[PDB]
Amino acid sequence: DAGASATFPMQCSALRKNGFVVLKGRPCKIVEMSTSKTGKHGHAKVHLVGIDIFTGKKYEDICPSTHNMDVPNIKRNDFQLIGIQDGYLSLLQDSGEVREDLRLPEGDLGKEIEQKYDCGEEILITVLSAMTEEAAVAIKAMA
Amino acid sequence: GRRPARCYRYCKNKPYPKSRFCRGVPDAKIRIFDLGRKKAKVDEFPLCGHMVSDEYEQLSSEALEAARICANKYMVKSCGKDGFHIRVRLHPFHVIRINKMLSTGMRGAFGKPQGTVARVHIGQVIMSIRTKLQNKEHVIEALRRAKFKFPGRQKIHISKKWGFTKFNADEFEDMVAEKRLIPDGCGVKYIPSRGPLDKWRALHS
Amino acid sequence: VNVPKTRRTFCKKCGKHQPHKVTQYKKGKDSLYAQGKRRYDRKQSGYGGQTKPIFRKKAKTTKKIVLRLECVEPNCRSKRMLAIKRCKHFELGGDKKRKGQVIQF
Amino acid sequence: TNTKGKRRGTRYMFSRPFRKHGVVPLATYMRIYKKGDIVDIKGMGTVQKGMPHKCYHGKTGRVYNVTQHAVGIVVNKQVKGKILAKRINVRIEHIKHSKSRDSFLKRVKENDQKKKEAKEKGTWVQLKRQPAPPREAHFVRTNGKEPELLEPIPYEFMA
RNA sequence: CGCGGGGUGGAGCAGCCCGGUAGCUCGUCGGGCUCAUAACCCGAAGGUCGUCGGUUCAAAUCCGGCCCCCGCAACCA
RNA sequence: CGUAUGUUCAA
RNA sequence: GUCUACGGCCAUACCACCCUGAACGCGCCCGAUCUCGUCUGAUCUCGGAAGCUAAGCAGGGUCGGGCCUGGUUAGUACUUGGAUGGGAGACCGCCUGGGAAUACCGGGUGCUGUAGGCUU
RNA sequence: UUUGACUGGGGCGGUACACCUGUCAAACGGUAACGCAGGUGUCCUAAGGCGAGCUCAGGGAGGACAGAAACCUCCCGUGGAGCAGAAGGGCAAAAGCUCGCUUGAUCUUGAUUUUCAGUACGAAUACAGACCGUGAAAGCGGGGCCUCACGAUCCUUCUGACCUUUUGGGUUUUAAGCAGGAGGUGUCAGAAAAGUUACCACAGGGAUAACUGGCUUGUGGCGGCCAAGCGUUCAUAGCGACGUCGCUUUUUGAUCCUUCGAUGUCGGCUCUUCCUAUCAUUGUGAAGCAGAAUUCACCAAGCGUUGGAUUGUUCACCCAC
RNA sequence: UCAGCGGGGAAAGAAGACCCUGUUGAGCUUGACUCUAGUCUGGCACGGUGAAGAGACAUGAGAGGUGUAGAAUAAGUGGG
RNA sequence: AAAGCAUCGCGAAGGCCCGCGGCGGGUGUUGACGCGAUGUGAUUUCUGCCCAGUGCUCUGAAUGUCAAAGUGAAGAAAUUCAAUGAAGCGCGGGUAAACGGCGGGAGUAACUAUGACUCUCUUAAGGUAGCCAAAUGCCUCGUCAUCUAAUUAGUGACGC
RNA sequence: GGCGAAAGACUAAUCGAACCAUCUAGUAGCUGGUUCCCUCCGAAGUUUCCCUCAGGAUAGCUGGCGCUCUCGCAGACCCGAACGCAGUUUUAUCCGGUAAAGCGAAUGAUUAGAGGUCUUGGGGCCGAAACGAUCUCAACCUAUUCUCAAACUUUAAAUGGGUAAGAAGCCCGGCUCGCUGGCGUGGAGCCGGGCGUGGAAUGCGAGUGCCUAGUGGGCCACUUUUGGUAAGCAGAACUG
Ligand SMILES: C/C(=C\[C@H](C)C(=O)C[C@H](O)CC1CC(=O)NC(=O)C1)[C@@H]1OC(=O)/C=C/CC/C=C\C=C\[C@@H]1C
Ligand SMILES: COc1ccc(C[C@H]2NC[C@H](O)[C@H]2OC(C)=O)cc1
Ligand code: MET
Ligand SMILES: [K+]
Ligand SMILES: [K+]
Ligand SMILES: [K+]
Ligand SMILES: [K+]
Ligand SMILES: [K+]
Ligand SMILES: [K+]
Ligand SMILES: [K+]
Ligand SMILES: [K+]
Ligand SMILES: [K+]
Ligand SMILES: [K+]
Ligand SMILES: [K+]
Ligand SMILES: [K+]
Ligand SMILES: [K+]
Ligand SMILES: [K+]
Ligand SMILES: [Mg+2]
Ligand SMILES: [Mg+2]
Ligand SMILES: [Mg+2]
Ligand SMILES: [Mg+2]
Ligand SMILES: [Mg+2]
Ligand SMILES: [Mg+2]
Ligand SMILES: [Mg+2]
Ligand SMILES: [Mg+2]
Numbered sequence A: 001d002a003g004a005s006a007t008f009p010m011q012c013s014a015l016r017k018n019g020f021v022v023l024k025g026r027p028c029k030i031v032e033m034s035t036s037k038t039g040k041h042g043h044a045k046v047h048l049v050g051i052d053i054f055t056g057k058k059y060e061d062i063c064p065s066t067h068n069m070d071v072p073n074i075k076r077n078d079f080q081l082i083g084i085q086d087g088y089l090s091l092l093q094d095s096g097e098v099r100e101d102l103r104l105p106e107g108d109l110g111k112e113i114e115q116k117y118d119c120g121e122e123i124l125i126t127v128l129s130a131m132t133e134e135a136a137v138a139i140k141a142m143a
Numbered sequence B: 001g002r003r004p005a006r007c008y009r010y011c012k013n014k015p016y017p018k019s020r021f022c023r024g025v026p027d028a029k030i031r032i033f034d035l036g037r038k039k040a041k042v043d044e045f046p047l048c049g050h051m052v053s054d055e056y057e058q059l060s061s062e063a064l065e066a067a068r069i070c071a072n073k074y075m076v077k078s079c080g081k082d083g084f085h086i087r088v089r090l091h092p093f094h095v096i097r098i099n100k101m102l103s104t105g106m107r108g109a110f111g112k113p114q115g116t117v118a119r120v121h122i123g124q125v126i127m128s129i130r131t132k133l134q135n136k137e138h139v140i141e142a143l144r145r146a147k148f149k150f151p152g153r154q155k156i157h158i159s160k161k162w163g164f165t166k167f168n169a170d171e172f173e174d175m176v177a178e179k180r181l182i183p184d185g186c187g188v189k190y191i192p193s194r195g196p197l198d199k200w201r202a203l204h205s
Numbered sequence C: 001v002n003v004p005k006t007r008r009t010f011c012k013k014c015g016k017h018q019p020h021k022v023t024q025y026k027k028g029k030d031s032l033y034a035q036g037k038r039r040y041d042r043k044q045s046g047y048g049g050q051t052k053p054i055f056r057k058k059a060k061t062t063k064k065i066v067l068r069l070e071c072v073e074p075n076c077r078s079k080r081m082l083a084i085k086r087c088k089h090f091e092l093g094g095d096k097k098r099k100g101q102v103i104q105f
Numbered sequence D: 001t002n003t004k005g006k007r008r009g010t011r012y013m014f015s016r017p018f019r020k021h022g023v024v025p026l027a028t029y030m031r032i033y034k035k036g037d038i039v040d041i042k043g044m045g046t047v048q049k050g051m052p053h054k055c056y057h058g059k060t061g062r063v064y065n066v067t068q069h070a071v072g073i074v075v076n077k078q079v080k081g082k083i084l085a086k087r088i089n090v091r092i093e094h095i096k097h098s099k100s101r102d103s104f105l106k107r108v109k110e111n112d113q114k115k116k117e118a119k120e121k122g123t124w125v126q127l128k129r130q131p132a133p134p135r136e137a138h139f140v141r142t143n144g145k146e147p148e149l150l151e152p153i154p155y156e157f158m159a
Numbered sequence E: 001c002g003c004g005g006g007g008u009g010g011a012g013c014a015g016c017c018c019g020g021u022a023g024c025u026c027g028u029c030g031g032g033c034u035c036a037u038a039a040c041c042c043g044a045a046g047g048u049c050g051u052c053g054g055u056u057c058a059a060a061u062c063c064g065g066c067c068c069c070c071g072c073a074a075c076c077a
Numbered sequence F: 001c002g003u004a005u006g007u008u009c010a011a
Numbered sequence G: 001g002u003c004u005a006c007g008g009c010c011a012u013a014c015c016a017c018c019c020u021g022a023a024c025g026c027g028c029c030c031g032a033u034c035u036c037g038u039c040u041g042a043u044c045u046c047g048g049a050a051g052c053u054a055a056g057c058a059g060g061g062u063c064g065g066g067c068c069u070g071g072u073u074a075g076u077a078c079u080u081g082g083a084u085g086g087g088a089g090a091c092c093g094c095c096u097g098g099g100a101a102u103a104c105c106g107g108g109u110g111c112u113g114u115a116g117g118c119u120u
Numbered sequence H: 001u002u003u004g005a006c007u008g009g010g011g012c013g014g015u016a017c018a019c020c021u022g023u024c025a026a027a028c029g030g031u032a033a034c035g036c037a038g039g040u041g042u043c044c045u046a047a048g049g050c051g052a053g054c055u056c057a058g059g060g061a062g063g064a065c066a067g068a069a070a071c072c073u074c075c076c077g078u079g080g081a082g083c084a085g086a087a088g089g090g091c092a093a094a095a096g097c098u099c100g101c102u103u104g105a106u107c108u109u110g111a112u113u114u115u116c117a118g119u120a121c122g123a124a125u126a127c128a129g130a131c132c133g134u135g136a137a138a139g140c141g142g143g144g145c146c147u148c149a150c151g152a153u154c155c156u157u158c159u160g161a162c163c164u165u166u167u168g169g170g171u172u173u174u175a176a177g178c179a180g181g182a183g184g185u186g187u188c189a190g191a192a193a194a195g196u197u198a199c200c201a202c203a204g205g206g207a208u209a210a211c212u213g214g215c216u217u218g219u220g221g222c223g224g225c226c227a228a229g230c231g232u233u234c235a236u237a238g239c240g241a242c243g244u245c246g247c248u249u250u251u252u253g254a255u256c257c258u259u260c261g262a263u264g265u266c267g268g269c270u271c272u273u274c275c276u277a278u279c280a281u282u283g284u285g286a287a288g289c290a291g292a293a294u295u296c297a298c299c300a301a302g303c304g305u306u307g308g309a310u311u312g313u314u315c316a317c318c319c320a321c
Numbered sequence I: 001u002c003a004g005c006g007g008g009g010a011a012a013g014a015a016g017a018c019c020c021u022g023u024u025g026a027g028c029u030u031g032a033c034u035c036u037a038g039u040c041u042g043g044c045a046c047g048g049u050g051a052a053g054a055g056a057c058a059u060g061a062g063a064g065g066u067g068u069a070g071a072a073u074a075a076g077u078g079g080g
Numbered sequence J: 001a002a003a004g005c006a007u008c009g010c011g012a013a014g015g016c017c018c019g020c021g022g023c024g025g026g027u028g029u030u031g032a033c034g035c036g037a038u039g040u041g042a043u044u045u046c047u048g049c050c051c052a053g054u055g056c057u058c059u060g061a062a063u064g065u066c067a068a069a070g071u072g073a074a075g076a077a078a079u080u081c082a083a084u085g086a087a088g089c090g091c092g093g094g095u096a097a098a099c100g101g102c103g104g105g106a107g108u109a110a111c112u113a114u115g116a117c118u119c120u121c122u123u124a125a126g127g128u129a130g131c132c133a134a135a136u137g138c139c140u141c142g143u144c145a146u147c148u149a150a151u152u153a154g155u156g157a158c159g160c
Numbered sequence K: 001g002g003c004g005a006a007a008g009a010c011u012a013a014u015c016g017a018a019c020c021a022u023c024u025a026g027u028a029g030c031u032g033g034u035u036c037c038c039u040c041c042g043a044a045g046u047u048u049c050c051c052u053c054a055g056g057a058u059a060g061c062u063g064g065c066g067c068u069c070u071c072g073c074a075g076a077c078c079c080g081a082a083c084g085c086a087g088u089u090u091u092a093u094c095c096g097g098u099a100a101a102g103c104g105a106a107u108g109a110u111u112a113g114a115g116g117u118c119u120u121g122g123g124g125c126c127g128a129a130a131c132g133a134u135c136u137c138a139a140c141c142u143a144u145u146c147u148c149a150a151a152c153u154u155u156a157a158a159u160g161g162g163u164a165a166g167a168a169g170c171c172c173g174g175c176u177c178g179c180u181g182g183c184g185u186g187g188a189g190c191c192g193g194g195c196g197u198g199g200a201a202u203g204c205g206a207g208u209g210c211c212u213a214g215u216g217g218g219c220c221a222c223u224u225u226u227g228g229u230a231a232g233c234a235g236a237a238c239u240g
């Protein structure tokens, strides 16, 4: 458990339309960046809005170009699915272990996952862990 | 377009060759450095004329191209399209820079490549023409015309060497008879009286 | 960085190399009765607003890992803090590196 | 502004000479260094331990301490407007005996020895060195041969 | 001369990000159905991932040059 | 539940 | 005259191809029980003594390559200090001292320490 | 109440703000720019430590499927490979590779080097005292082959002593100490910090921009030299490509020397004078000058160069003389 | 010396308003930092007399299946 | 500013506001045809789409957060730990005459051109009725017509 | 605060916060000024750190005060009877990678022709059923050849940097050690004695402490040198 904080310090103006940012204590992904130098001759400010990494809730913020913004730490990995019990998906590790914790998504995504499992084919889901919570938000298949 | 050549006449900077530290250099104006009958055998063109620089200056690639064309054109008129061989002895390896000033100041002024020049020394040969002896007057006259494409003073010197080789013309024939100068295409190969005796055997076989 | 859960290193109380149980040091809970905290609460009392600086310009993206080494001798349960260099990823007793094996994509 | 790097600018300084790379010849370690002798510091890039700093390469110092693999040397270092006697530890791979001190020490023995024979023989042997005196008078025999006449050569344009 | 966003089957666009396997819709082609066309049904083919290098065991992906196409900025006298 | 169309003249 | 063991300097010793090698040695060489180690007694380790200098190795050779050294290059290039020197400049000459590097042309081809051996 | 700094004015931008490699740098060392080419905030239980064996990149030849490319063998192979990363240096019975064992990346006091004020931090060098690893042993090793990879006071937190104090004494909790780590200040010797002002203010500054003048002349304008070519033919009547040499300050840039206790800013209007690189007019030379017209050139600035529509316009454009 | 005149005195008037610098301000703004009037809300007191209700918590039973197989797997979860 | 238009709060224990303070004071000698707070600006004709964002507002069964006081448990006590859970926030709904916002690429008609038509990406919605080189258009002195001998002007038209 | 049909308008010539007194001689890294004479010495615009860049702290450069020593004589008259150092050379020795040079030496760049020709490809021809024959052009190899390098180099200067040129030396005898060790071995230290030709030239008297101001905007020239077309331009080295 490295001491490295989930909070990662980085500038604001050096953030693009792909970068991950934490807005109002919420991990977010940038969806729009427009700078603006008010005053005849003053500091330019950057206006940026990030849609959440887990929720779809957009988040908006205004920061001086020079100012710095926290960047989140993401642990991403995709594991194949074996079994669904009581809403708790059973997953398999490359280490060889099986943890049946987490949960299926609470929307159209989660339902679409389980029906694939019921049919039975190349299935493996990603595990996104930021801060303290977790969300399985992606699907993949072999070829 | 190009700045006037007066802006890059003097060897003011250290050599700045096209290298891994200098990218995006436009190709030099001059590409063909040898023209005429390059294949002619060493013994066909004994007379050699050189244009020698009398200043320590920079000659642009465009300047080298214009003189090459000017000398070539006249030599075809006076001796024939195959009565000589012209070699430009300067290759533009020095990259000159330009700090493009388009309507900020001298901040970050280190320029971008603009072209290439050939840093010439006092007495360095600029271009050489080898032909038959009967065409000496034309080679001086052809080299006289090419002088007007260069800045500074140039001198035309008829070399006492044989053709484009480094051996004196008055003794070139003797060394060839004694097998110390084997004709090797354009030039000759010097046969040192050393090395395995087998090589001496073949030569005299 | 992988560090084993155990290592044989010098024990100050034993005066000799002993096996040591290696864990990761974590900061304790602030006492709230520490002199510095008792002063801070007394200073912040009443009006005046914030009386001490609040550091904001964070720049470090790592921390120095401190290992809590404990002597395994039952009569000497001595602990010593040993710090290693900054690292983004740290695990105790991870699976060791092997050579000449397939990547497994 | 340059870097403060400890080995900046030592590309050629600490490089090995051409065709002199590889194993360090062992007479280097067989040399004996005692307190008080004079050593030339010359860092060698093959051995990265006990390196002298670049400011001490080409400097000459006096040994004041001897250890298992290294010696303590007192070297004069000019710091702006003052010279400091710096005590540096360098492994013996980067030093060698100053031949100048060895030549002088030989002359002291020779002077002291020569003085003893000057007493048992009267003669006065010169001990102090003398700057090259003006050449004494001499004759120069032509040996019949008239001196060759030299003339400047005509200019020839060699291009 | 700056800053950013892109170039991926015939068209539009994912994949990038988040190195291991190029996909969606439409179109194209072949066979049904129909008297015939479309609609509908069953299938199939199709991409140098702008180009050149580098990293890597492995590059559409990471990094660096060049080309192309689009936006932003250019203020106080 | 849910589909549209059928080039010009010509008995 | 020369070897072996351990070397110092580390090509004047290296590299290619060749000729020769008495003696002792060093080798190759024979074998795997033991010691030891290998897919393989090839290597490594061990036990030997039928054969051979074929090889290694040693000495020599070669208008040999390399290397070392000298000449030439050349008082040339460059350079310390100097001038109310020249020249529009670029640059150049002089005075005062220092002084290189190719190509090209010769010569050389290990020296040596300690200990032990061999050569009527 | 704050709203950093550097800066060829300031803002935008960049970080040249803390560092590392090669260069600049002028053969000790030191040496600047918003100089050039790059790199850093990491990575590693081995990629640390020791020992052992081994030799790499590449190429040639050969060998079932097997081919440019799978694996096996021989030969050549001074390193043309690899050593985490940028680069430079270093390294071949190794510093590379493979294997075995390990925790010298441990505990402790000083000295020294680097930056340097010769302070600190960081990093490093050589020892010493313990306790260990490895190897038969010599020996090597207190992190990474070397040159970067990091952080004061206060505070907090943890670890060590049958430790000191906790205030009249005693026991216990608690709190405070001493020593060593960590939590971090990247503006990296380390404030806790958003804008606007054309409604503006003060102290100043020609240390510093906007106008004038100066230097410069890329750019703008004008001229020459050579002569491929154009010119029914014919380089040069008139032209002049590829090149190349200049002049001017009538454009714009570049610079910031003068002026910020003030040199009134554009344009017009009015008025004088001056320059010539001559449009006309006087005298001429040349023609691809029959005449007329036109073009080129010389002496030449004496004299003249206008009336209006649109535009604040300089500039344009058109109408008319 | 007189009347004029407006080329020059980089004429006078004013410690440049522009611009920059100052670890100098002020007017205004806000997602700047730190506060605050007010306001919302909870608690304690003033704060009393009746009446009828509820919840949590702990203690012990003896029950809690059901498309399915068994014919009650009360529901699981182990050692079995 | 204005009439006109629209929106918002409030039934008095109230709305809006004053005030250091007195449940003091203004509106108020008032009572929704009133008072208070905003926008727009006569009349005429219209006032489209968007509740994703930011406001505002409604709701509070219930989960997630959530202070002081209280309650419990351990302890010699200081103290610690737990349970409990106000408003607010979060969660959900409404609201644009609240602040405000209102899209790209490609193909296509039997001359050509163009494109009613179709494909595809995509938004909260993709600028509707209108109007225009406008006191609002860089390019620009836009293009056409008119006005003049001549128009960077004017006017009419056109509108990616 | 008022008041404003709203211009930040008006509120006693005052308004984007009136006027009066006080706090208050408010603070200013900023501008200006800073008063007699002579005498002697006499700078700095550079280093490091600083929310530092118009300022400071720091070292340097300065002055003042000293102190510690060295150097005197033949004579009332006349008359003889070195402590140490250095903006320098010399001698010895070490250091270096610039100038130049080099590329038929590595690395990188680069022009031409020649000869081979195993293989590799193409053109083309015979053959043409099949290989096959044959020629050419390339690639490839070999020997040559043109031209180059701040971030290349085998070589390699000039100028330059360090050190040494004795009495703290040398020579001989002895002793101590817990270090080292086959060995009174090695090393170091201590004690006693002996030895002056003061062991290159030239010049000069040195050593040492305290207190300390101003400065910390620089600018120019030769030569070297970076950016820039260039600049009475911007930035360095060296000495003046
Ligand atoms: C930066 C802080 C720790 C540092 C190691 C540190 O020492 C800070 C130091 O004490 C500041 C003092 C020093 C000074 O001498 N006197 C001053 O009074 C302030 C902390 O970091 C966080 O943990 C949270 C970091 C998130 C940011 C919010 C708060 C910082 C809290 C922690 C104080
Ligand atoms: C942008 O155009 C301009 C800018 C400044 C000035 C004034 C200055 N010019 C010279 C002096 O410095 C000053 O004259 C005065 C009186 O202040 C004029 C025009
Ligand atoms: C520039 O505009 C200046 N001369 C005038 C400023 S107006 C406030
Ligand atoms: K530098
Ligand atoms: K550098
Ligand atoms: K018909
Ligand atoms: K043999
Ligand atoms: K040992
Ligand atoms: K700072
Ligand atoms: K010009
Ligand atoms: K001024
Ligand atoms: K409150
Ligand atoms: K009321
Ligand atoms: K909305
Ligand atoms: K809303
Ligand atoms: K080369
Ligand atoms: K000072
Ligand atoms: Mg230059
Ligand atoms: Mg000329
Ligand atoms: Mg309080
Ligand atoms: Mg090391
Ligand atoms: Mg139809
Ligand atoms: Mg039909
Ligand atoms: Mg019909
Ligand atoms: Mg019919």
Ligand SMILES: [Mg+2]
Binding pocket: none
């Ligand atoms: Mg055998």
Ligand SMILES: [Mg+2]
Binding pocket: G053
């Ligand atoms: Mg033999």
Ligand SMILES: [Mg+2]
Binding pocket: none
């Ligand atoms: Mg030879």
Ligand SMILES: [Mg+2]
Binding pocket: none
């Ligand atoms: Mg020689």
Ligand SMILES: [Mg+2]
Binding pocket: none
């Ligand atoms: Mg600034």
Ligand SMILES: [Mg+2]
Binding pocket: none
């Ligand atoms: Mg610093």
Ligand SMILES: [Mg+2]
Binding pocket: D009, H025
């Ligand atoms: Mg240097």
Ligand SMILES: [Mg+2]
Binding pocket: none
């Ligand atoms: Mg130097």
Ligand SMILES: [Mg+2]
Binding pocket: none
């Ligand atoms: Mg140097």
Ligand SMILES: [Mg+2]
Binding pocket: none
């Ligand atoms: Mg390296």
Ligand SMILES: [Mg+2]
Binding pocket: none
């Ligand atoms: Mg080894």
Ligand SMILES: [Mg+2]
Binding pocket: H019, H122
């Ligand atoms: Mg450092």
Ligand SMILES: [Mg+2]
Binding pocket: none
């Ligand atoms: Mg030790």
Ligand SMILES: [Mg+2]
Binding pocket: H143
């Ligand atoms: Mg180590």
Ligand SMILES: [Mg+2]
Binding pocket: none
């Ligand atoms: Mg404390």
Ligand SMILES: [Mg+2]
Binding pocket: H167
């Ligand atoms: Mg007490």
